[PDB]
Amino acid sequence: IVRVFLPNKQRTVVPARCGVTVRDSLKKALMMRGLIPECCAVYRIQEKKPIGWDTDISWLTGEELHVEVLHNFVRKTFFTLAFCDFCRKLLFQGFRCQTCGYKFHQRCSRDRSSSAPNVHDWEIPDGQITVGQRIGSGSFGTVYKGKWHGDVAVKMLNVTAPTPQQLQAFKNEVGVLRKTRHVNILLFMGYSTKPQLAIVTQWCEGSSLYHHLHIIETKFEMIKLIDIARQTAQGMDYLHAKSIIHRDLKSNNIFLHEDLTVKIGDFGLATVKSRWSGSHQFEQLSGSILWMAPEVIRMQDKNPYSFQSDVYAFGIVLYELMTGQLPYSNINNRDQIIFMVGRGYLSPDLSKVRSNCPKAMKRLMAECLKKKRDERPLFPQILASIELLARSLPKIHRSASEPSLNRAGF
Amino acid sequence: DKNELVQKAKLAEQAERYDDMAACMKSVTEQGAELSNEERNLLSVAYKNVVGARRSSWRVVSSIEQKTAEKKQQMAREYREKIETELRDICNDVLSLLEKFLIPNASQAESKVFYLKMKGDYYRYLAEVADKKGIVDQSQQAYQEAFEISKKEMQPTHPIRLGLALNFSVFYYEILNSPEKACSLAKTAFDEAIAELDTLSEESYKDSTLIMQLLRDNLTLWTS
Amino acid sequence: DKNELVQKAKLAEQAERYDDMAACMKSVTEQGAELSNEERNLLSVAYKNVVGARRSSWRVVSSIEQKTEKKQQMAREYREKIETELRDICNDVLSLLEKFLIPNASQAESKVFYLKMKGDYYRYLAEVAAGDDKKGIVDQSQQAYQEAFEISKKEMQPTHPIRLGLALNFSVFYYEILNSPEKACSLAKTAFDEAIAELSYKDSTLIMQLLRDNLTLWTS
Amino acid sequence: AFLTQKQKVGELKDDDFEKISELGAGNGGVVFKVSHKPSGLVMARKLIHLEIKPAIRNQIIRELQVLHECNSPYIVGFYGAFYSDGEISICMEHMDGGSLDQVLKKAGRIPEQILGKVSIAVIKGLTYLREKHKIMHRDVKPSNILVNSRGEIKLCDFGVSGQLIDSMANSFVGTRSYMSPERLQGTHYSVQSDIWSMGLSLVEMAVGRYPIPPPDPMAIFELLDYIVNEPPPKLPSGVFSLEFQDFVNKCLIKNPAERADLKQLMVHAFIKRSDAEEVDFAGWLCSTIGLNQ
Ligand SMILES: CNS(=O)(=O)Nc1nccc(Cc2c(C)c3ccc(Oc4ncccn4)cc3oc2=O)c1F
Ligand SMILES: [Zn+2]
Ligand SMILES: [Zn+2]
């Protein structure tokens, strides 16, 4: 008897024999999990040392093992925005998997080149700023609903009397960050620095995505669960075309109104953050720990952020978006989440995802949550694969059916 | 004749020029001779993308009608019918090809299973598109004797049986709306394949596995 | 009716069959009426796919045509069947362009795109054409780009999308066809730096990365 | 012999309290103090807010009433909690010494002669929690040890609700971590964790210096790297007795196999040595806090 775990911690005692490899023996319990014995990894420990599939059970008797995951290729020629996924170029013609939605060029696995695509002061003064009421809290501040010729918001924060050279950069942070005019972003009326420092925004009805996915739990279907992956990646491409890292991507900050209009706020602020306890940029871990990458939890760099650490903060608002629960919702701890997320021992379990989730996404949401940073895709592609299968949903609105043959020749 | 007509599809598949290899595989099987496995699946490969694309289109075309006056609503109606006429004719081409030449000359068991498997599948596309009860019933029969002959010859992990079981399950739910019959046979074919999944042919090793995970995706979707 | 024409394409716009709408955009302006923006956008997107579908079909079968001889000879007549459609499909627009589109340009952005559209459609013919007609077709796009490219500078913004689209198409014409990479890489940088110096936005930036992506390749 | 009673209280609602001042600024929750007109006695107002499902919130409040039967002079008594203002109001006893977080920040250091007395109270206050209620503290930190100028020291803020253990575990950020390696490595061995969480807490009292950056600040994650990768810290000698090192080093070993059971922690001589010598605690704080009687 050689006990082995499974994804979702499930248990199965496979038989112990001699001369026949783990592959087909484990495949039985594996295949009810839908795991081919060519794509997964199993571990033997003398932390977690992987072992393959050609191992006879003679040396494996009486040992506990884990089961952890580590293609039929038709051809196609892509008639809209299609970005390769092995060198992340622009794809016009090339392969595509039938079920997993992952396209790539055979070249990258006298030749041609590329071409065109298939087209389609000024600070809020004190006095008139009507300071609001008790509204709540968050990671670094508080909302105050203002009343001055319309609906606005006021914030507070944690640096009281900064050095004069700090404040002039604050006039430049807004100049970089007041230019965010978009449809996914609420307007920025300015800020009030004569009173305690603020970051003035608008106010929106409805609520955020965290309220919609942890309190009311009015879970939607993919016609809306992929629209939200659209009207939130788009608001995080304009935010990165001009290099303003959100660095605050929370399901609690995605304030959508009427369930049609999607709005995003509460971002930026590298001067209020990076506290000037002296005259440095020493940033601090204030807030939650789920929307944070391994290297933002680690803080092992002076500035460990990136546009990638805004993508590991997009999978967590996506792995929340499908299942309906929240990531790491079973560990009855605080410092255990921080240790593993920072270390690389544990990552969110993808077994708890829905049964009707499109397999084309399994190569998207897994990238937006990879342990490393040099792998997760940048935000223009996120709006690409989510426009792609936002309208390919009526094509795949049925149950399954028998697919085509290989059509792949090497 | 056949040798050139095999290549003319092996050159129109690679360039996604389907309607050429839809109208050239029809011309290599109306030769009146038997089909080896090579040109066998290409005949299915050819039509599946040809007949599927308008179904893949009519699904998209009709959905916009489900996404909606008297002028805008009308405009999809004529166009969706224009898909229907194109889809109806392509369905009948193989059905006429199946009944007149293919099925009578089906010498081998799994081949006899295969061409019958197409027949129900093809009426299924007319079933989803569309008296109307004759289409759904004849698919049920064509599946029915397809499944019945499947139980005898081939090893119980064959893609054709599971593909039929996967196919025949979908007809139960999406037209008749009887998932419990669909769930059981999908479960039965899936579960039975578990025990019989001994050492398996490398050729069908990849193809059978791809089917089985889809069956669970049907089951795991059908559990709710 | 103009409403019916624009709608009918939009029902097939996402249906993945692109020949059907390409066969109805011809009827849109065969009357010769004034073109707004969106319909003019729908006119462009059609034949790029239809040619692209043919070009992508053209590309692959050429590899078989370049693979090798009893089997290989089947490709050539099959190959020549593709362009015979492809040449006919493209020449429909060039006939349409030189009858109702180009001589009816009104605004600053009207003239620039059609000429680049005319040049690229000539380039698509220039991809395959041989013999004495090869350079004759290639030449007729040299001015087609040149006519528009000099209008782009004086009439529309450095970041207005058409110029980057034109510059990228104008630049790529020099390397693959003209066998003139030096005139290209030194030319992309001019348009590359023009927009970034004085840097509705997504279309702009993707051409920008393509400009840098092509500049890197052109330097390879 | 201590005569603890909480029957005087009646219905509890926000309009029946008038605030006086704030006890101090805590880490996870901020502690207040308020005046209740009917009861009259001063109370400790611990306001922690959780925007959670009301059913989950309601499942916890009813479980906060089990604090009534966990009565002792070793654990702070529970006046009563209720839901209002959108916030959870965990009222507690108002003890004039706050906790021993202020004490270290005011007195600068705490001598060995005091640690002997407090270690007696907690090791039995924890025993009152385990052997009776079958649950343990899970939150052994110095700022959860309420003290007063009456000569008494007591514990507070244990795990009263397994739901709010996790519902707040993603809201209790903090910056100092005393959690045991067994509670961080990925499993739970609760029987031995609270000993470490007390072993490290006392070193913060004996020396007053946070030992995770070794004596002989680090990033919030970097502390746990020390905690669960390399051998544990140890108390300085000289000013501390060598037989006191026999106590702390038996409470600060990673592997629970070498950890001594609670029963082993009363069979030691030093734990039975601390109570052999008496210490005044009425005038001790009054000579360093400015309070009287
Ligand atoms: C930090 N470690 S953890 O174990 O992971 N998490 C937690 N551990 C303990 C506790 C908590 C949360 C928590 C708090 C804040 C609390 C506060 C006052 C209280 O009332 C009271 N009354 C009388 C005597 C003692 N308390 C009971 C309480 O119960 C709780 O569960 C963790 F969130
Ligand atoms: Zn590539
Ligand atoms: Zn795949």
Author numbering:
A (entry chain A): 156 to 201, 204 to 227, 235 to 273, 360 to 370, 449 to 738
B (entry chain D): 2 to 69, 72 to 133, 137 to 230
C (entry chain C): 2 to 69, 73 to 203, 210 to 230
D (entry chain B): 52 to 267, 307 to 383
What text appears in the publication on this structure?
RAF kinases are essential effectors of RAS, but how RAS binding initiates the conformational changes needed for autoinhibited RAF monomers to form active dimers has remained unclear. In quiescent cells, members of the RAF kinase family localize to the cytosol as inactive monomers, maintained in an autoinhibited state through intramolecular interactions between the RAF regulatory and catalytic domains and by the binding of a 14-3-3 dimer to two phosphorylation-dependent serine sites (pS365 and pS729 in BRAF). In response to signaling events and RAS activation, RAF interacts directly with GTP-bound RAS at the plasma membrane, which ultimately disrupts the autoinhibited state and promotes RAF dimerization and kinase activation. Here, we present cryo-electron microscopy structures of full-length BRAF complexes derived from mammalian cells: autoinhibited, monomeric BRAF:14-3-32:MEK and BRAF:14-3-32 complexes, and an inhibitor-bound, dimeric BRAF2:14-3-32 complex, at 3.7, 4.1, and 3.9 Å resolution, respectively.
To maximize purity and homogeneity of the MEK-bound complex, an additional protein preparation was generated from serum-depleted cells that had been treated with the MEK inhibitor CH5126766 to stabilize the BRAF–MEK interaction. Here, using serum-depleted mammalian cells, we were able to isolate two monomeric BRAF complexes of sufficient homogeneity for structural analysis using cryo-EM, resulting in a BRAF:14-3-32:MEK structure of 3.7 Å resolution and a BRAF:14-3-32 structure of 4.1 Å resolution. In these structures, the BRAF monomer exhibits an autoinhibited conformation with a 14-3-3 dimer bound to the canonical pS365 and pS729 sites and the CRD making stabilizing contacts with the C-lobe of the kinase domain and with both protomers of the 14-3-3 dimer. The BRAF kinase domain in both monomer structures displayed the canonical kinase-inactive conformation, with the αC-helix in the “out” position and the R-spine broken. For the larger monomeric BRAF complex containing MEK, the active sites of MEK and the BRAF KD are in a canonical face-to-face orientation, with the C-lobes of both kinases making extensive contacts and the activation segments running in an antiparallel manner. As expected, MEK was in the inactive conformation with its αC-helix in the “out” position and density for the MEK inhibitor CH5126766 visible within the allosteric-binding site. In addition, residues of the αA-helix of MEK, which acts in a negative regulatory manner to stabilize the inactive conformation, were resolved and lay against the base of the MEK αC-helix. The BRAF RBD in both monomeric structures sits on top of the 14-3-3 protomer bound to the C-terminal pS729 site and adjacent to the C-lobe of the KD, with N163 of the RBD being within hydrogen bond distance to S679 of the KD.
